[PDB]
Amino acid sequence: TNLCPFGEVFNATRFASVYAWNRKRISNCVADYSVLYNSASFSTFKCYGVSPTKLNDLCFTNVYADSFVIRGDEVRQIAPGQTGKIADYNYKLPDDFTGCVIAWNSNNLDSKVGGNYNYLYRLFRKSNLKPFERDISTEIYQAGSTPCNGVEGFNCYFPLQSYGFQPTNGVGYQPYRVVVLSFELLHAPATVCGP
C-alpha cells in the first residue's frame, strides 16, 4: 500500500497561469479520494461523471491533473457547457467529461501588496479553442485588415493581459486556485485503484 502524491499538487507554492495550465500525469498508485472530499478548505468541489461518494471503487487506466489560477468571478466558466471567454480562449473542457473540479480561494498567498505581474491571461485569438489544446506561443495579433509588421500601434495588439490581483478588492476579484482532475479508462490494465 503506497499512497499517491496528491500533496505535491494541491500544496504547490505557486500555480501556473491560466493560458499555460500545468498538466500532470498520475499512474501506478492507490489514490486516496477520502481526503480530497472531506477537506474543509475548498469552496467548490464538483464532480460530473461520477458522484464523489463512490470514487473508492472505480479503477481508471490513467488520470491527469490540470492546475492553474483564475479570477474569483470567472470560476463559473469551468464546466462542459457554460461557455464564455476563459473557457473559450484558454482552457476548454470536453463535452463528455468524466472528472472533477476543485477550486478554492487563496487570497493571502497569490496576491502581493503593491500589485502582482506573474499572472497573465490570453485575449484576442483567431478562433475558439478545441478541447484541451494548449497554446503557449505568443505572436503579435491583428485587429482588422492591417499588415502586421511586428508593429502593435492600433494595427496588432499584444494578446496577453496582466491580472492586477490587488489585496484589497472585493471577493469577486481575488485569485482562486483551480485543479481539474480528468479520469481515463483507456484499454489497458487498471493502473490505479482506491483501497
Epitope: 502524491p5 504547490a12 507554492t13 501556473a16 492546475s67 506573474n118
Partner: antibody, heavy 127, light 113 residues
C-alpha cells in the same frame, strides 16, 4: 553529470532587449527552484531573480523591478530571462544556480542553497 | 528590504590558525519552524562561487568537516578550525526569509605575512 549552460551575451546599446537562456542537463529539471544571480565587474554578487518548482516566480531585486521578466519551461529543460530597457549600469556576469532541497522532502517549500553554478556570460552595454 | 553587515571587513589569516567571521541582520530570521534561513557562500579567486553552509549550521554536502557555523537571532558566525593554503577568497552571507534575498558586502580572506 549536472551541467548548467547559459547563452545570450554580447554588446548591446542602451535601450534595447536581450534574452538570456540557461539549459540544465543531468537531473529532474522541474524538481529544483532555479535562480538568476548577477555579478558586477570586480564587485560582490547580487541576487536578480528566481523561479520555484511550479513555474511561479518569487520576485525580483528592488532596483531592477519593472523591466526583467523570467520564464521557465520544464518540457525543454530551459529557463529564460527577457531583459528590456537597459541602462549602462546592467553590465555584469550572470550565473544560473540551482536549489538543494527536493520539493516535499523536509514547513514551507525550499528556496535556499544555490549549490551548482554554471560559468556565466559577459553581458555588456555601451555606445 | 533587509540589509546585512559582516565583520571584520577584511582579515588576514595564516595557515594553521582558526578563523571567525560574523554576519549580522536587521530582522531576526527565526521562522515559525524554528530554523534560521541564513546561508554561507564562498568564492575562490577566478572561479564561480560555491556553497558552504545552508540552514544556519546544517553543513553542506561535499565540503570537509573543518568549517563550523553557529549563532541565531540576528547574529551568526562561521569558524574555520584549521585554515590552510586553499582557503583564500571572498565570503558572503545570504538571507532566505523575506524576498528579495540579499548578499553581504563580503569578507576578503588572504594570507598574512
Amino acid at each position: 553529470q549536472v551541467q548548467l549552460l547559459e547563452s545570450g551575451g554580447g554588446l548591446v546599446q542602451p535601450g534595447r532587449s536581450l534574452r538570456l537562456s540557461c539549459a540544465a542537463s543531468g537531473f529532474t529539471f522541474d524538481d529544483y527552484a532555479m535562480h538568476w544571480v548577477r555579478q558586477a565587474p570586480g564587485k560582490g554578487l547580487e541576487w536578480v531573480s528566481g523561479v520555484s518548482w511550479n513555474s511561479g516566480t518569487i520576485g525580483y531585486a528592488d532596483s531592477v523591478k519593472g523591466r526583467f521578466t523570467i520564464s521557465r519551461d520544464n518540457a525543454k529543460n530551459s529557463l529564460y530571462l527577457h531583459m528590456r530597457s537597459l541602462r549602462a549600469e546592467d553590465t555584469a556576469l550572470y550565473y544560473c544556480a540551482k536549489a538543494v532541497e527536493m520539493v516535499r522532502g523536509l514547513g514551507a517549500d525550499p528556496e535556499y542553497g544555490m549549490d551548482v553554478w554554471g560559468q556565466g556570460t559577459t553581458v555588456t552595454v555601451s555606445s | 528590504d533587509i540589509v546585512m553587515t559582516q565583520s571584520p571587513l577584511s582579515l588576514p589569516v595564516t595557515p594553521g590558525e582558526p578563523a571567525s567571521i560574523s554576519c549580522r541582520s536587521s530582522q531576526s530570521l527565526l521562522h515559525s519552524n524554528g530554523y534560521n534561513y541564513l546561508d554561507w557562500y564562498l568564492q575562490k579567486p577566478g572561479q564561480s562561487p560555491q556553497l558552504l553552509i545552508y540552514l544556519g549550521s546544517n553543513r553542506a554536502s561535499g565540503v570537509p568537516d573543518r568549517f563550523s557555523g553557529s549563532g541565531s537571532g540576528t547574529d551568526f558566525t562561521l569558524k574555520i578550525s584549521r585554515v590552510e593554503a586553499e582557503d583564500v577568497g571572498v565570503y558572503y552571507c545570504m538571507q532566505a526569509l523575506q524576498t528579495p534575498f540579499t548578499f553581504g558586502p563580503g569578507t576578503k580572506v588572504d594570507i598574512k605575512r
